């Protein structure tokens, strides 16, 4: 049973958490082909293995920058979580290594691109299209939460689309192992639950709120709470007033009202029946949960190898490796 499934998932997770591999490869084994994304977080590049010819998404982190930004713990934790989890909609870490100046996480490449760009390009997704993605997130959170892992950064920008049109969740720098409450202020403005913003001790239910935000944006083409800057966004979020596009179905609106619920005693995913209130909701009546997990549902939309047509362009910058080792002790466990 699904319960029985989660059972084994936990054992395998605890098992892999103890044991994390280090330097399973080296930079000389990869040919950089294109920078797929860059920013404060660092940068991800499409690379091609010089021996097999296979492609991967390599995330490069500048050690001195990570320290400067005080993300040492987060960086070590994402690697640790990544190699310890296993679910069809969670991206996998295939190689990791470091040199004098940088840290490298070589992960599965998602040819389809960022869900973000497709959403902005197309405008909005039809309810069935939105439902197909939503279903994947529900299962992923069911899985993560059973391991006491809170994702804490759900958004179109972190959801990649693979060759079959399914989702690959990326970026676990904010994910945290927590049984009850936690207190760190983190996440993305538009997707923050009210309790996070109010500096209260919160729980995994913030991911469910985020799901509501995600479904709304996918279906409307824009987030439920927006403003010129974070401060104003927070005001609207805590006020909890949401208005739905007229094209939103009665079932979709009901689901969203229960997901975007400030009252934690009433928010779906946080009640006695757990994720079942979501999975059994009218809007998901036609959803075949088992078929989704098994990837037997033909994706509503499906964007040679090494192709990067689905990603945006960024200026290619050097991969400088210093002569002196930098921040050796800080990243000794990486």
């Amino acid at each position: 049973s699904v319960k029985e499934f989660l059972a084994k998932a936990k054992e395998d997770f605890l098992k892999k958490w103890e044991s994390p591999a280090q330097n399973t490869a080296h930079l000389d084994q990869f040919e950089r082909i294109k920078t797929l994304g860059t920013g404060s977080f660092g940068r991800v590049m499409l690379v091609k293995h010089k021996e097999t010819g296979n492609h991967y998404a390599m995330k490069i982190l500048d050690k001195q920058k990570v320290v400067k930004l005080k993300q040492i713990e987060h960086t070590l934790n994402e690697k640790r979580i990544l190699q310890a989890v296993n679910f069809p909609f969670l991206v996998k870490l295939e190689f990791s290594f470091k040199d004098n100046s940088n840290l490298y996480m070589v992960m599965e490449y998602a040819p389809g691109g960022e869900m973000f760009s497709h959403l902005r390009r197309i405008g909005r997704f039809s309810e069935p299209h939105a439902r197909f993605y939503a279903a994947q997130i529900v299962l992923t959170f069911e899985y993560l939460h059973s391991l006491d892992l809170i994702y804490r950064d759900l958004k179109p920008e972190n959801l990649m689309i693979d060759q079959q049109g399914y989702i690959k969740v990326t970026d676990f720098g904010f994910a945290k192992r927590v049984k009850g409450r936690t207190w760190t202020l983190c996440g993305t403005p538009e997707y923050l639950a009210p309790e996070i913003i109010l500096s209260k001790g919160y729980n995994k239910a913030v991911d469910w709120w985020a799901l509501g935000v995600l479904i709304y944006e996918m279906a409307a083409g824009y987030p439920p709470f927006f403003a010129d800057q974070p401060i104003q966004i927070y005001e609207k979020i805590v006020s909890g007033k949401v208005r739905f596009p007229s094209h939103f179905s009665s079932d979709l609106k009901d689901l969203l009202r229960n997901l975007l619920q400030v009252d934690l005693t009433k928010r779906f995913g946080n009640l006695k029946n757990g994720v079942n209130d979501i999975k059994n909701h009218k809007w998901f009546a036609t959803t075949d949960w088992i078929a989704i997990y098994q990837r037997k549902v033909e994706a509503p939309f499906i964007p040679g190898p090494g192709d990067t047509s689905n990603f945006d362009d960024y200026e290619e910058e050097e991969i400088r490796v210093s002569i002196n080792e930098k921040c050796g002790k800080e990243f000794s466990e990486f």
Binding site: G39, E190, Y222, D228
Partner: peptide
């Protein structure tokens, strides 16, 4: 329109996590 207001907000591009 609500959509118009969204654009006017100016946060239509990729959003960063808060730091």
């Amino acid at each position: 329109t609500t959509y118009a207001d969204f654009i006017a907000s100016g946060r239509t591009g990729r959003r960063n996590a808060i730091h």
